[PDB]
Structures are given as structure tokens and as C-alpha cells.
Symmetry: D2
Subunit: 301 residues, 4 copies
């Protein structure tokens, strides 16, 4: 037997950080959950009970809090890059650091139409995430994402012209409800190290804002032919707006709202143009995925 | 053996309703989860296998969708009162209907600074709830609530002067983080029937809006002496603003954010006035409850 | 405004305790989650920012661990009674202690057909719970429960003879799947204090075992006319087997398994006597409740 | 823009199947949740609103129930292989089918020491899973797993000799609690098609049973030097017992149980050899992973 793959460390590390402007009294909070898993010359911990190669997960936890004390926690792409770089530089025998960060929403409260200096509301369970893989000799691979963005449109969704055979019962529709939970990931060009990540810092918040804006506007305005066709338009617009992105991935459930035939009861009309009351279906659901990149096809376009 | 208490019916009934203004094209959606449990002369279903006294839960489910088709679903206090009244009036042997409704947020999307006619966002897992108990011969008892409103303030919370004995380790503080999930319930005066509920319909949305506004402003502006003292101020202001409320109940967890002593590492200062990085605690938590009503004490005030 | 009701304390306190037989090497573990809420002369903490009347929830947490160190944690009815009594005796101004305990399963592992001395498995998310209300001057009110016991029978469940009117679509059945999550509560006679609870200690484990045995055997052997009729038989047998119980309460969801008509596909027969493949429904569900006590009817039985 | 990756279909499809021995009256139930995602010449559904290439997820759902009606659902490796093969054979333009199955426990009830013919208990939320990737021209890749197996040992776990530097606070221990949720995956040799999967059918149940037995016995008997060292022993034994497995992967959280120093209270001794009461930590947790395969190193072993 031999170790083909190994990583270890600490998961579910909750972190809060406050910034206090002593001049204005304005406070700003940041809250996240962090996972750090290390790789390197660690196989003997598995094979030989050699704990000398283990940077204790407790120590990794201490290091997350120390890094957050001594560095910005925003944008999360930067914080993740700083943290991962620390582990591969500090420890000769550690050759990769895998940093996952989930960012929790704390939106400043408006009280009597004025922003409150130190009060916040969890305005959505929507998250902003990063996956930062720091690989010694191979730079920094960053995937940025928004997840748990739950949306619904009551019309301007269609689904007709799909394959029909002996397995098919679904009726074509020219007007249905569309509801999803948006998981959208943008994959950055490889960065050579922390200096190159730092040189692009304003692009992280800007690209997250673009991804969210494009997701909401496209969902709201596309007279959707399918989830497939709608998500492709979101991905192509985000790629057009940030050249340092290589790919945009969407993973979208089709959260069904079924019509309810009430015609058995006093001839009530609640289908088609008369549909007012629907049954939201918890399961099953459609699931639609794609990864969009830029073309290099020159023939048979 | 004898039946001391019994109720039965249908839980977790997901309901969506759309309103379509054909003039403006503006669509408005409502989504809820409904539970209806009936009481009455039903003991023989338990004791004698007498199913003749059971209004099938499947039929109760059909009735929820039919009621939603033929009546407003908003405010939920009205929808609940209509539904509960239907069961005690339709069925001679049914003497109480217990209607619980959870209302899910679908907030209209703003696209390029304009409200979209048919696109919505789940802007919070915060709920608006009702419990409506329709009791034949005893009218309609309504409890209204907001739940899952998650808030945090980074300063202007204190906790000192508490009892200290041989069980006490907690340090007094003059500056801590306060974070909670707000569960706030307002209990209406008994209504004689559906006509009296209908006569007060505008008060339901107005009182929910008042409860939320008072909760947010008080949380944000109170230099809090304790969760106890802060919630009491919220409850007294809501009672002052709606005479048809008898009681206001709060149930608030104290969701702890602990300081992290980093002085063992390079003398880093992260406690007291230098506290920037905190550890959010998932459990345990403080839990603080109270029900506030109006006084009738004339002596020893 | 005046305080009509108030309680406060600590929730979600996770507790583990190990017993080590040094003679045999056999270790036994206990794991629970504890909530303690106090009542008494505490209104000034709410009305006057008077923290002198608050036994800090942090101190209540310390007290749970100290009690567990100095006393048995089993049966949970005893541990809860000890803990609640401590608060009303130690603090003159505290007049009630509300102790909720959830007990988590750690079942000894059998390895090569022999019980392992120190290895355990979470063999079910089924819980054993207590609610212990210690009220100064009014003794100790205990409710014991089992919850999250998930069961299914594939036949010997029926549902016919229910009310049929213009709201009814459900077909009568003489053979259906029955599946539920069992919540069963037994309410003890009021105990005068801790001495009387201690005098009955063996009855707590014995009555929990009886409730579980009766629940499983009745579910498995009753050719069920309805959930109502089946749960009534469980409750009456548990009352017959423990005179110190006053009431037995069941709360049972009817977790539906729907037939799937496949006759549209190659005439496949999958309904009635040919039903093999079913669709489990996550929601909605039936919900059936009753509280059974002993009779004192002497006429019109 | 161009489609670099795409799949779509149906998730969260709950399936139940009953087998009825008419001779013995013995019934056997199977319950699972199924996901099927297809790949192939489907990019035009994304780029051109061409729904002609979509096998509707509703049709995929119908096909799961039809397959379950016409074929064994056990072992899940076989059911998954049948289902995936159907999609790549039926549809010329579909070139891969990705089938994920979660199997839910329904263990036969023993009533009065005899197995009941038609009553079952969810004896654990532990799952048995498969991932079956059917790739046209490349056969059938199967990963089998057990997940959610929650275990604890109260002693015979150690953690000492780990790296100590300026980030390290953790104390070495020679006796701690070890608790985890076991996620164990075994990767099968590539199968050429459905005939080769069928030729190995008895190996699926046997290898799952081996993986579980080895996991439980090793956890219980290993005087653990670390999670790393313990999981490596499990993986090497499972590889030794099934030559058709290429790799065994473990993913194990270290679910911490912290000692509680009570010496501040009446000198109570609850640490080290006197530790009886512990605080289970919900988060953070250690996370330890490895993939073990067979060696081909001939030098520098
Ligand atoms: C309703 N529906 C299916 O059944 N499949 C699909 C699909 O892949 N995409 C859709 O937009 N809708 C839909
Ligand atoms: C921190 N803290 C306790 O320990 N108990 C209590 C309490 O009841 N109320 C608070 O506001 N804080 C607090
Ligand atoms: C299927 N079904 C209903 O619709 N209602 C009821 C009920 O109250 N009890 C049952 O056992 N089944 C059932
Ligand atoms: C307690 N502890 C750490 O902090 N890290 C680790 C690790 O990787 N492995 C362990 O078994 N324990 C442990």
C-alpha cells in the first residue's frame, strides 16, 4: 500500500473581524468560515505514525486568527492567498495549501433613512466564497463564487421543443414559473504568487459585483427558452467584462412550481391562463450545469 | 383510557399565489407553508376505528388550495381566519381549527434602479408567521410573529452588575458584541368572528411593520445594559403603538462572539480596546424570554 | 407596561460524561444537550436594567458541568431534577427552573461478537428527552419522551371510511405503506421534591424501555385502521404498564409513499396489487396527535 | 464564448421499492435518492436555444422509476450501471451518464426476538452510496462509499510528537477522546460495460460489508497515534481483501471533546486522569484525508 493523495488540517473555523474608524465612529464587520488543508511530505504521518511532519490543525486554527489580526480579511481572494502562501513559505515540507472561505453577509442597517455606524443585518443567507490553492512552484489558483442566491420569476420562462419519445410525459409550456438557487463560479488566470494577486486586488470585489449584477439582470430580462440558454448568456457576459477570468461555471436547480387542477371542485379554473395557486415542489428538481470559456475555433464556427 | 386531547390534519403544505395586473403587467407573488389541525367530536377515530369523523388530511390540503384560489392570501392573519372559519362552519362536529402559516420573502428585484414587474429575490430567510385558533363559540385568537431576523451590533452592548458567587467566572464588560435571531410575537385581542377580523385588516400589515421597525431601531440605538433590558424597551414601544395588541413576547438567543487572546504569539494585542479578531460560538448560547402586557397596578408601582 | 412572563438562561449546552470501571476496564459514555431557563423575582433586569437579579447564563453553564461532575447524569429525569432543585434552593429569588435534556445515542460496539470496552456507535439519531420543571412550593413536573424514531411498514395499513364531500379526492385503500417519526411523551405524577424523584429512579429507564417496546410491537403488529387508531392502542398499553404516568401523548406525521402509474409506458402495471415502485413525498404530510389519560366516566361509557 | 463542460438532468429523485415473497409473506424494502446528469452533443441547448437535444429531466425522472420497476435496485452499483447504460445506448447524442445514488437504511424490526415480515426501522442515518459514471467508449467507473457512520472511543487515542513552533499552543496527550463521522470510498477497476459489472455483482455487497467491518474493528482496536495513522490501517486492510478495488479514500473529521478545568470551583479535579465531564465542540474540527493505492516502488521502499 502507498499514499496516492493526502491532505489534512482544520475545517469550520468561524472568524469575525471588526474595523473601527476612531475619527468617524463608523465600524465595519466581516464574518467568514475558513477551511485550510495542507499537502506535502506528510505520508509518514499515515504510514509510520510520524507526527513530526504534522503542523497540528490546532496550530493552523491559531494561524488563521493571527493572519486575520495582521492582514486584511477582504477581499477574501487576498486573505486566502496570504494564508496559503504563509503555510508553503513557513514549512519547507508543506508544498500546497488549500484555503476555502465562506463569507457571511452583514449589511449595514439603515435607521430612519441613515446608515447606522455599528448595527448590521443578515440581509440574505447568500454567500460569497473563494477556493484558493497555493501550490509551491505553481503559483495561486483562485476560484471565486456566489452561492445561495434564491430568485423567482412568475412569467417569461418557457420550455418547449425538447425531445419526445416513449419516456416523455412532460407537456410543452410557453409560460411557467422559473426559480433557482444561483451557484456561479469564476476561475481566475493562474497568479505567479502573492505579489501578482495583490496587483489585481480591486478586480476581486468588482468582478463579484459584475457576476451578481449580470446574474440578476439576465434572469429578470431573459424571456427564457430553458435554464441552459439563460445561464449561457450570464456566463458569456461575465467573461466579456473581465479578461483575467478564464471560465464561468453555473450550477442551477430548476425548483418546480406545479399547477393545481381544481376543475373537479365547482369547475374552478386554475390552469393555463387562469393559474393563480401553485404547489412548490421540494423535490425532485432539475439540475443544469455548464462551464463557459473563450473560443479559439477558426473553422466550422 | 380516554382521549384528553386530540387534533389531526395536514402539515408542511407549500402554497404559492400570483396576482397579475393585466393593465400594468406588474405581477406580485406570495409564498407560504401552511398547517391546519382540527379538533372536535373525533375521539371515536382513536378509540373505535371510526374514520367517519375524519375530514381526511388530503381533503384539508385540497381545501387550503381552494381557499387560496377563492380568497386573498394576504395579510396572513385574514387568510388564516378565513380557512379556520371554513372548517368549523362546514363540519358540524369540528369545533376548533388551528392554522399555522409561515410566509416566505419574495422581494421585487430592482434592475438598473427600476422595480422589475415579475422578478423576485429571497432577500432574507426572515419569516412573517401567524397562529390562528378558530374556536366555535369563542371567536378567533391570533398570534402574529416575525422570526429569523438575524442582527449584530459591534459595540454599545454591556453586561456588568450580574450576581457573582462560587459558580461565576464571567468577567464584567462595558463593550461587547451583541448578536441575536429575533423571534417577536404580538397577541391580538380575541376577535368574535371573521367579520371583526375583516374590520381590522389594515392593522395586520401596519403592526408587523411597526414591530420590525421598533425591533431594528431599538437594537441599533439602545446602549444595551442586557438582552433583558433591550427587549423590554422593544415590547413596551410596540404595545404603545397598537391598542388591539394585548401582549408582546420576545425570545432572543445571545449568540456569543468571544475575544481571542493572541498575547502568547509575538505579544500580539487582540483583547479589550485592541480586540479586532473574535471567535463566533455556534453553541452554547444565552436564551432570554419575556412577555410584556399593559399594567393595572395602582399601588406599589 | 409590565412583565407578564419571563425566563432566561442557557441553551444548547453540550455535555459528555464517561464512567471508567478501573477493575474491568469497561468505559460507558453519556452525551446530552442541556437547556436551563430560570424564573423568579427577575422583572427588574427587564424594567430597570437591574443585573443584580441575573444568575449569569455563563454561571448556569458552569453549574451544569459541576452538577454533572458531582452527580449521576442518568437517568436524565434524575439529573434534570437535581439541576433544577439546585437553582431554586441556592438562589432565594429564583422560584422555578426549567430543565430540558436531549440524550444522544452512544451504543457499545460489538467487535467479532464481543462488546468492546470503550468504542461506541451513534446507532440512531433517535433521542431520549426530559422536560423537568422544578417549581418552588409545587414540586417537580417531569415529561419524558422518545423522538426521532423513524419506522416504516410495507403493508397492514388501511385508510377507508373517512368523510367524503365536495373537497374529497382521496381514494379509499385497504393496503398502503405507513411510515412515521415517533414523538411519544409520558407525563409523570407531580413529585413533591428530589427525595420522591430519587425513590422512583428505576422506573425512569424501565418506563422509557416499555414506551419504546410498546411503540415498536404495536406499529409492527396492528393491522392499522388509521394513525389515530394505532397510536391510541400504544398510549393505552403504556398507561396500563406504569401507574405513576398520568398521560401519554403521541405526535405522528403520516409520511406518504405514493403509487406511480406507469401504464402510459408499455402498459407497465405498478398500481394496486402490482405496486412495487413508489415515490416517497417529503411534503406535505398528515399530522396526527392525541393525549390519552385514564377514564373516570361511570355512565354513558 | 464556448461550452467547455456541460451536464444536466434530475436530482433528489426519491425512490422506494418493495419485494413481496407471496410464499413466505416476507416483504423487503429499499429506499434511495437518485441523481442522473447526462453529457453529450448538447451544447446547442445552451448556445442556440435548441431544446431538441434535451432529454427532459422529467423524462429522466420517469426513466428512473421505469428502470427500478424492470430491474433490481440492489446492489446500487448494478442499478446505477443499468440506468447509466440505458441513457448512452437509447440516445445516440448522449455520450455520458453520471448516476449518484444514496441508499437509506430500512433494517427489519425484531419483535419478541423474531424478525418481523414487513416492519422496518431507520437504525442509522448512515448511508451506502454509489457514483457510477457510464462513458460511451470508456466503460463504467464506479465509486462505492459508506458515509455518516458516527463513532466515538473514550480512550486509546493519543496525539503527541507533532511539530511545535511559535504558532503552537496544543498540549501533547497520551489519552484523549476520538470521535468521527466516517466517509470511506472504494474505487473499482474500470468495467468494460454492463456485462462485466454483472459478472462481479456479489462483490459489491461483500466489499461494502468488508469496508464497514474493517472500519469498525480498526477504530475500536487501534491504540491510535493520530487520525492519519488509524485511517491508513483501515485503507490498507480493505485493499488487501478486494483485488478489484484500485484505491480506498477516507475523509474523517476530528470531532473534539475538550476537558473542562473545574479547579476554580471547590478544587474540583476534572482534568487528566480525573477527567469525567467534557465539552463536545460543534466547530471548528480537524479534517484528515487520504487516498491509498497499491505500491509499485521496487527501490528506496
Ligand atoms: C422542465 N424541464 C425538464 O424536465 N428538463 C428541463 C431542462 O433541462 N431545462 C429546463 O429549462 N427545463 C426542463
Ligand atoms: C453574558 N451573559 C450571561 O452569561 N447571562 C446573560 C444574560 O442573561 N443577559 C445578557 O445580556 N448577557 C448575559
Ligand atoms: C391519508 N389520510 C388522510 O388524508 N388523512 C388521514 C388521517 O387523519 N389518518 C390516516 O391514518 N390517514 C389519513
Ligand atoms: C488535535 N490534532 C491537531 O490539532 N491536528 C491533528 C491531526 O492532524 N491529527 C490528529 O489525529 N489530531 C490532531
Amino acid at each position: 500500500s502507498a499514499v496516492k493523495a493526502a491532505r489534512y488540517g482544520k475545517d469550520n473555523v468561524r472568524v469575525y473581524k471588526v474595523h473601527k474608524d476612531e475619527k468617524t465612529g463608523v465600524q465595519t464587520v466581516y464574518e467568514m468560515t475558513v477551511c485550510v488543508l495542507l499537502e506535502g511530505e506528510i505520508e509518514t504521518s499515515y504510514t509510520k505514525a510520524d507526527n513530526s511532519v504534522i503542523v497540528a490543525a490546532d496550530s493552523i486554527k491559531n494561524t488563521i486568527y493571527i493572519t486575520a489580526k495582521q492582514n486584511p480579511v477582504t477581499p477574501p481572494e487576498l486573505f486566502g492567498s496570504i494564508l496559503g502562501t504563509h503555510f508553503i513559505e513557513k514549512y519547507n515540507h508543506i508544498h500546497a495549501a488549500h484555503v476555502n472561505i465562506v463569507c457571511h453577509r452583514w449589511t449595514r442597517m439603515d435607521i430612519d433613512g441613515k446608515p447606522h455606524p455599528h448595527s448590521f443585518i443578515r440581509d440574505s443567507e447568500e454567500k460569497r466564497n473563494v477556493q484558493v490553492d497555493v501550490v509551491e512552484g505553481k503559483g495561486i489558483d483562485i476560484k471565486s463564487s456566489l452561492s445561495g442566491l434564491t430568485v423567482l420569476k412568475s412569467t417569461n420562462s418557457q420550455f418547449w421543443g425538447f425531445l419526445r419519445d416513449e419516456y416523455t410525459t412532460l407537456k410543452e409550456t410557453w409560460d411557467r414559473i422559473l426559480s433557482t438557487d444561483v451557484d456561479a463560479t469564476w476561475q481566475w488566470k493562474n497568479f505567479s504568487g502573492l505579489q501578482e494577486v495583490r496587483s489585481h486586488v480591486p478586480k476581486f470585489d468588482a468582478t463579484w459585483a459584475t457576476a451578481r449584477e449580470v446574474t440578476l439582470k439576465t434572469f429578470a430580462e431573459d424571456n427564457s427558452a430553458s435554464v441552459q440558454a439563460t445561464m449561457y448568456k450570464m456566463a458569456e457576459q461575465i467573461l466579456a467584462r473581465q479578461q483575467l477570468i478564464e471560465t464561468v461555471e453555473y450550477s442551477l436547480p430548476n425548483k418546480h412550481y406545479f399547477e393545481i387542477d381544481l376543475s373537479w371542485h365547482k369547475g374552478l379554473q386554475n390552469t393555463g391562463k387562469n393559474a393563480e395557486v401553485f404547489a412548490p415542489q421540494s423535490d425532485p428538481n432539475g439540475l443544469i450545469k455548464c462551464t463557459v470559456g473563450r473560443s479559439s475555433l477558426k473553422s466550422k464556427l
